[PDB]
Symmetry: C2
Subunit: 244 residues, 2 copies
C-alpha cells in the first residue's frame, strides 16, 4: 500500500467465452458478440459524434467519460476520430481530448487480453498499452499521435471537484458509462449528475446505456434535456440528452 496507496487494481476472471468479467462488480465488461458495434451505437450514436465532427466550430473536441474500464469506448472513439480526420483533413476540428475516470484500473496483462477481442482496433490498442500508467491516484496524461487521454485514477465522486470551475462549459460530449446502476450504485449520484451538467458546453450532449428512472430524473434535475432512444439491438431503451 505504499505500493498503491488507496488504489486497488481490477480483479478479473475470464469466462468460458474468454470475456473479461469484473470480480469487483460481478459483470462482463462488454458484449463478447457486439461490443464494438454496441459502443459505436450508444456512445458515438447517442452523442451524434460522427455527424458533429465536420460541423464542429472549434479546433478541439472534448469528451469526458465516467468509467474507462477496458478502454473500449476510448479506442472506438479514437478510430472514429482518425477516420474523420482522413475524410475531412481541412475541417476546423483538428484535435481530440478525452478525460476519463477509473476506480479499479486493469493491470497491463488483463488490458492486453481484453483488447485481443477487437483485432480491428489493434493499431490504437497497442499504443494505449505502451503508455498504460501505474495504478496510482490522480491524473495520468497520455500524449498519443492530436489525441490526448487524461486518465484519473480513484473515485469519480471525490475526483470530479478537481475539474474546477475552470473546466465549466468545456465538455462537448459525456460518456455516462461503467457498470450498471444495480452493479455499481455508488457511481450514480446527484453529485455526479450535477457536475456533469456544469462541465457541459451549451449544446453539448450526453449518452448512457441505462434508462433507470432515477438516472433520467437525476440528469433532468442537474439541467440536461433528456430523451429515451431505442437500445442497441433487441434492447428497448437508452437515454440521451443535451444541455439547453
Amino acid at each position: 500500500s505504499l505500493k498503491h496507496y488507496s488504489i486497488q487494481p481490477a480483479n478479473l476472471e475470464f469466462n468460458a467465452e474468454g470475456t473479461p468479467v469484473s470480480r469487483d462488480f460481478d459483470d462482463v465488461y462488454f458484449s463478447n458478440d457486439n461490443g464494438l458495434e454496441e459502443t459505436r451505437y450508444v456512445f458515438l450514436g447517442g452523442n451524434q459524434l460522427e455527424a458533429r465532427f465536420p460541423e464542429h466550430p472549434h479546433p478541439l473536441f472534448v469528451v469526458a467519460e465516467s468509467g474507462f474500464g477496458t478502454g473500449l469506448n476510448f479506442l472506438t472513439l479514437w478510430q472514429a476520430f482518425d477516420q474523420f480526420r482522413e475524410a475531412h483533413p481541412q475541417a476546423q476540428l483538428q484535435r481530440l481530448h478525452f478525460i476519463s475516470f477509473e476506480k479499479f484500473p486493469l493491470t497491463r496483462a488483463d488490458l492486453a487480453l481484453a483488447h485481443q477481442h477487437w483485432p480491428e482496433l489493434a493499431p490504437w490498442a497497442e499504443q494505449l498499452q505502451a503508455q498504460w500508467p501505474m495504478p496510482l491516484p490522480g491524473c495520468h496524461r497520455l500524449l498519443l499521435d492530436r489525441v490526448t487521454l487524461d486518465l484519473w485514477f480513484g473515485d469519480i465522486n471525490e475526483l470530479i471537484s478537481q475539474l474546477d470551475d475552470s473546466l465549466n462549459q468545456k465538455v462537448d460530449a459525456w460518456f455516462l458509462d461503467g457498470f450498471a446502476p444495480a452493479k455499481n450504485p455508488d457511481m450514480w449520484t446527484q453529485n455526479l449528475f450535477n457536475a456533469m451538467a456544469r462541465l457541459a458546453r451549451p449544446g453539448g450532449t450526453l449518452a448512457t446505456f441505462t434508462s433507470a428512472g432515477f438516472v433520467r430524473r437525476g440528469l433532468q434535475e442537474a439541467g440536461f434535456t433528456m430523451q429515451k432512444r431505442k437500445g442497441f439491438g433487441r434492447k428497448r431503451e437508452m437515454l440521451c440528452g443535451v444541455m439547453e
Copy 2:
C-alpha cells in the same frame, strides 16, 4: 486549464547571482553559497540519516517531504543513500522510497537551470530531469535506479488525506521543508502536523529549518517529542523531533 486543471507551474526569476527565486512566494529556493551543505546538515543531520542507515532494521527506508521545490533535498538524500550502499552493500537496508508534495512544480527548463548550481549532483540530477513529470494533479511515481520517488502535485493539506490509514506508522523520517512560515503560512497547519504524526513510524524522526514557536507547539500537540538544535552556520536554531 484543460492543460493544467488547477495546477499552476512555478513562476521563477533568476536573481543577479543566478539563484532561482520564487515569484509565487518571494524568496530564493536555496542558499547560493551553502545550499548542499545546509540541506545535508538540516535534513540528513537533523534526522540522523547517515548514522541510521547501517543500523536500520528493515529493507526499505521511507522518507516523506512537505515541499519538493527544486529537488535539492531529494538529490542530496539520493547521493547520501547511494554512498551508503557503496560502503555498506550487505546491510539489511537495500531500498529507498521518497514521497514529496509540491503545489507549484517547476518547468523542466527552470529545473535544469536550478540544478546547474550543484555540479556534484549532476549524475542524479540528470536522471530526475529525464523523468520530470507534467504539471498535473496527483501522484507521479518515478522509478529510478532501488530508489522510488512519488511526486504529489497539488495542495499538501488537501492531499495528505490520500495517504490513508494504510500508510500509518510507515514514515521513517520527515523533511518539513518548503518556504518559511512567514512566506507560505498556508502550508504550516495543525492538520499537516497531525497527519505527519500519524504517518510516522514509532522512533521515526522529523527535522525542519524553522523554529517558529507555533510550529514547535503544533508538532508537540500532534505527538512528536521536539527539541531545538543549532541552525546551520551562524543561524541560531532549528527544530527536530522523534515519535515516542
